[PDB]
Amino acid sequence: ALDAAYCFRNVQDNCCLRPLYIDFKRDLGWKWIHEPKGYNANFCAGACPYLWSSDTQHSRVLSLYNTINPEASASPCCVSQDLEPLTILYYIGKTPKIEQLSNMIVKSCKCS
């Protein structure tokens, strides 16, 4: 899979998971989140050659098309596949609010 095991050890040009730890206040200016302080959001990025982790028939055909006609800018894109939720605690004045946000962390990628 296009995951941490395959992708983190050594960076390649093709679509792969890329590490990204986001600090809420440092990176986004969001001071309202009390816990956690940050999380591993990660991101997907990289080229999508013919049949490289193709999502649909459309991805397959377009990866071929892009190889023959790169100028058209029609390549499939490296995007999230598997994601995980993240629970946060924030305060509304003096009210603790717990919220489980879905699809916050990317664990794998694909060419779509």
Place this chain on the structure above:
Amino acid sequence: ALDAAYCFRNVQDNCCLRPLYIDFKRDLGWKWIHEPKGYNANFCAGACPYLWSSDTQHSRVLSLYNTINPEASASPCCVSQDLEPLTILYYIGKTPKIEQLSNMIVKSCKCS
């Protein structure tokens, strides 16, 4: 929606559906498909600003992050949302083979 109605009349920089008619033999060298001769595959392409057709919480956060830190190359990507199948007829020697291929045509996009 990021569809033909919104996107085809006049090209913009943000994520939007882009027209693409693919001729099997002319564009891909595939001479094996008898019918149809080509089809409107289309493709998604364009920038993904904060909250522009955001797919998941991950897309939301990353669109914000990319605005503040464009150099990280972590922007969400403009990809297919709604797709349609395509039926083809090809011959195996003297055998007509009908196959309904799923997700061949893109009708709408999203920032993922």
